[PDB]
Amino acid sequence: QPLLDAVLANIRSPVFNHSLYRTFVPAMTAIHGPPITAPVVCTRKRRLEDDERQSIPSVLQGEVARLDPKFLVNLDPSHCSNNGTVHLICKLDDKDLPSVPPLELSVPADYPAQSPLWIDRQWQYDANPFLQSVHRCMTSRLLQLPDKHSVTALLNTWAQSVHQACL
Amino acid sequence: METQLQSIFEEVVKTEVIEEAFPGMFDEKTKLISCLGAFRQFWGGLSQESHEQCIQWIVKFIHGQHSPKRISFLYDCLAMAVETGLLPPRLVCESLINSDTLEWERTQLWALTFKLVRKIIGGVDYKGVRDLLKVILEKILTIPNTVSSAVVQQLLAAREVIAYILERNACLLPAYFAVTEIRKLYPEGKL
Amino acid sequence: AMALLLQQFKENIQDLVFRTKTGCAFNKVLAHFVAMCDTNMPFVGLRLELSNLEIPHQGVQVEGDGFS
Amino acid sequence: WFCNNLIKELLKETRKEHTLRAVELLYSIFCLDMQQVTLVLLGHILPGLLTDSSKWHSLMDPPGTALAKLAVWCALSSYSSHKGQASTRQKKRHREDIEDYNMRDPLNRVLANLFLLISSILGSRTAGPHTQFVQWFMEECVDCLEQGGRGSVLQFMPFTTVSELVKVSPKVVLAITDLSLPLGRQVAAKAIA
């Protein structure tokens, strides 16, 4: 119902909106007498400096640090200093036969990253038929994973296939 | 219609199932060759002329995914299909060469595309081959000068294939035509 | 509805998995199956629900030894 | 400004043959003051180009490779024994420079400075022209009877520098292998991969 004041205040859209002071602040000072508006020590400092400058993205290491002790993570020659930020080598230590370690080179946190690429796929996997079939089963299992995550999903499926390898 | 072919290709390639939480026991050769045979039968069926736009639809559906493993497995079946004589190269090259490159956007997709281009770089072609060279150089020039420092080998793949072409030009394809293609890139020196 | 079933589970490698272990009726296997299904279905449902916002990391396990 | 206008005029051919001819003749006309002039030229233009991205525009051209060849040539000539007795040089050989960067030698100091700047430019997070430039540099650095990049083994960067360079084929892998010292064994194992 009270629409005249609304549209009338909306008319004064351009930059010259200052008389509102003389129209309202006398009445406000009359009814309200608050000395406490912003007397406390305060200053606006939005940003000074924000960057890692010390390590890899925190989310990845923080998440992989809580994985099982069955795995072991370390670093290769540093060919992923800034962008990749991870070049990991994992060796499954459990009640099963081990295998060739993965590459584990990830991308930004969107994670469309099939991090291992099997650089030594051909010979190291044609060495024996058993591990060759193991690799084949792994690859067949990987494609069904929608938007897999190298951090958890990839390694988990790899361990699952390696433990199912005994048929 | 084209939607029928798209649905057929989807059914031949899509294997959407439950999350498979429960461990279940029950494709590189069986399913791949089966999909290849099905797509070959659809090829032999009809729509020979309009298979240009049909393969455009095909590559669109291929790019409609996000799992690099899936896109690689997809590209592989087209690779074997073209190398086995079926689906002559010219069509697939002229289709994939445009509208789906995604310049330095999808490093994985870009990489696999240029790898399959390197594979098909044999590519027996008539005088109408300068066009694809122009397309490659036009896509290259859009790349900036300081994009990054880690994505290199993926970009060298384009450099690799263009070097392969420019060097085999002495023995593979007409050289002078390739030279005349560079005139759109070298106007007496333009960096 | 009568949608497809596909027998997507380990049918019938369950016998070989039981025999390949290191450890009257053997109804335990059906018991195990119904138990794992009843205990996984809420989890996979919540997982597919959360798979619309972010982080669809499927099949993660808490330290493994938790058996959950 | 002498060398500035030199490289400016050099960056005008945009064709390999004339750029090569220009740099060949420039190395010759640059003589009679080889050591100090070349040291100052390098220590001014190479940082003056790698420091920002504005100057990266220039080095993108094969003129950049020609300039790298000029740089390594004058460096190898200067490091070797040199008399350098000219009219306008003997009477004008009184200056002072610390370069704000074994032994304490001006030429050696400048060489270490440029090596450190090369290793720094080899850094990540941005690379269009300059990794290729330093690649050309390392390639042309290959030369018999050479002794540059001595890499003193006390507290110096050349070790990690060659490590990162090989982490980018056997040129630097062999240059760092001065005397098969245990320090060199590290970069050997790294280049073995």
Nearest CA in chain A to D165: A79
Q: What are A89's strand-pairing partners?
A: A74
CA dist B164 → A50, B101, B178 (Å):
45, 19, 13
Which residue's structure tokens are 């490289």?
D7
Would you put residue D149 in left (φ > 0), alpha (ψ -120 to 50) or beta? Answer: left
Which residue's structure tokens are 């540099």?
D137
CA dist B94 → B91, B100, C35 (Å):
5, 11, 55
CA distance D94 to D75: 21
Write down which chains contact chain D via at least 3 CB pairs under 8 A. A, B
Interface check for A147 against chain B (CB to CB < 8 A): the answer is yes
Min Cα separation A53/chain B (Å):
17
Interface check for C64 against chain A (CB to CB < 8 A): the answer is yes
B174: nearest Cα among B118, B127, B122? B127
C10: nearest Cα among A100, B55, B63, A167? A167
Task: Retrieve residue C15's tokens.
Answer: 């016998």
CA distance B83 to B36: 12
Q: What are A75's strand-pairing partners?
A: A88
> Kind and range of the H or E element at C64?
none
8 Å CB contact between D157 and D181: no
A99: nearest Cα among A163, A32, A42? A163
D64: nearest Cα among D122, D132, D128, D113? D132
8 Å CB contact between B59 and B100: yes
Across the interface, of A83, A143, A160, the residue whose CB is closest to B69 is A143
Q: What is the torsional sign of CA B97, B99, B105, B106?
A: negative
For residue B182, the tally of other CB atoms under 10 A from its CB is 13
Experimental technique for the deposited model? cryo-EM
Nearest CA in chain B to D11: B191
> Kind and range of the H or E element at C32?
helix C28-50
SS3 label, residue A85 = coil
Write down which chains contact chain B via at least 3 CB pairs under 8 A. A, C, D
| Per-residue burial over D51-73, b = 16 or more CB atoms within 10 Å of its CB, e = otherwise | eeeeebebbebebbbbbbbbbbb
| Per-residue burial over B17-48, b = 16 or more CB atoms within 10 Å of its CB, e = otherwise | eebebeeeeeeeeeebeebbeebeebbeeeee
8 Å CB contact between B65 and B101: no
CA distance D42 to D36: 10
Q: What are A90's strand-pairing partners?
A: A73
Across the interface, of D123, D124, D167, the residue whose CB is closest to A77 is D167
Across the interface, of B69, B150, B151, the residue whose CB is closest to A142 is B69
Across the interface, of D56, D124, D131, the residue whose CB is closest to B145 is D56
Residue contact C58–B19, C-beta within 8 A: yes
CA distance A102 to A125: 13
Chain C positions touching B67 (Cβ under 8 A) are: none
For residue D150, the tally of other CB atoms under 10 A from its CB is 16
Write down which chains contact chain A via at least 3 CB pairs under 8 A. B, C, D
Burial of D174 (0-12, 13-18, 19+ CB in 10 A): middle
Burial of B158 (0-12, 13-18, 19+ CB in 10 A): buried
Resolution (A): 4.7
Write phi, then psi, for A27 (nearest 5 degrees).
-65, -40
H helix runs in chain A, sequence order: 4-11, 20-31, 58-64, 121-126, 129-142, 155-164
CA distance B35 to A164: 28
8 Å CB contact between C14 and C29: yes
Q: What Rg, from alpha-carbon coordinates, does chain A have?
A: 31
Min Cα separation A135/chain D (Å):
24
Task: Retrieve residue B44's tokens.
Answer: 């032999």
Which residue's structure tokens are 């099982």?
A68
**Residue A27 CA, distance from chain mean position:** 53
Interface check for B150 against chain A (CB to CB < 8 A): the answer is yes
> Kind and range of the H or E element at C57?
none
8 Å CB contact between B51 and B58: no
Mutate to test the interface with C, among A115, A147, A155 (most CBs of C within 10 A): A147
**SS3 readout for chain B:** CHHHHHHHHHHHHCCCCCCCCCCCCCCCCHHHHHHHHHHHHHHHHCCCCCHHHHHHHHHHHHHCCCCHHHHHHHHHHHHHHHHCCCCCHHHHHHHHCCCCCCCCCCHHHHHHHHHHHHHHHHCCCCCCCHHHHHHHHHHHHCCCCCCCCCCCHHHHHHHHHHHHHHHHCCCCCCHHHHHHHHCCCCCCCCC
Chain A positions touching D164 (Cβ under 8 A) are: 78
Interface check for B24 against chain C (CB to CB < 8 A): the answer is yes
Would you put residue D151 in left (φ > 0), alpha (ψ -120 to 50) or beta? Answer: left
Q: What is the torsional sign of CA A100, A105, A109, A114?
A: negative
SS3 label, residue A90 = strand
Q: What are A73's strand-pairing partners?
A: A90
For residue A95, the tally of other CB atoms under 10 A from its CB is 8
**Residue D25 CA, distance from chain mean position:** 19
For residue D139, the tally of other CB atoms under 10 A from its CB is 14
D173: nearest Cα among D133, D141, D130? D141
Selected residues 25-44 of chain B with any CB under 8 Å from a CB in chain C: 25-26
Please report how many Cα atoms fall inside a 13 Å half-sphere around the Cα of residue B111, on the Cβ side: 12
D76: nearest Cα among D148, D171, D21? D148
Determine B/D contact with 3+ CB pairs under 8 A as the test: yes
8 Å CB contact between B70 and B44: no
Amino acid letter for position B99: S
CA dist B190 → A60, B187, D28 (Å):
44, 6, 29
Chain D positions touching A79 (Cβ under 8 A) are: 167
Residue contact A140–B27, C-beta within 8 A: yes
CA dist A105 → A11, A109, A116, D64, D69 (Å):
59, 12, 6, 33, 36
Q: At what angle do helices B68-83 and B107-119 cross, to 10 degrees?
A: 10
Residue contact C63–A156, C-beta within 8 A: no
Chain C positions touching B18 (Cβ under 8 A) are: 8, 44
Nearest CA in chain B to C34: B22
Contacts of C34 (CB under 8 A, 6+ apart): none
Min Cα separation B22/chain C (Å):
7
8 Å CB contact between A86 and A104: yes
H helix runs in chain D, sequence order: 2-10, 16-29, 34-45, 47-50, 56-59, 62-79, 87-90, 106-121, 130-141, 158-166, 171-175, 182-192
Interface check for C16 against chain A (CB to CB < 8 A): the answer is yes
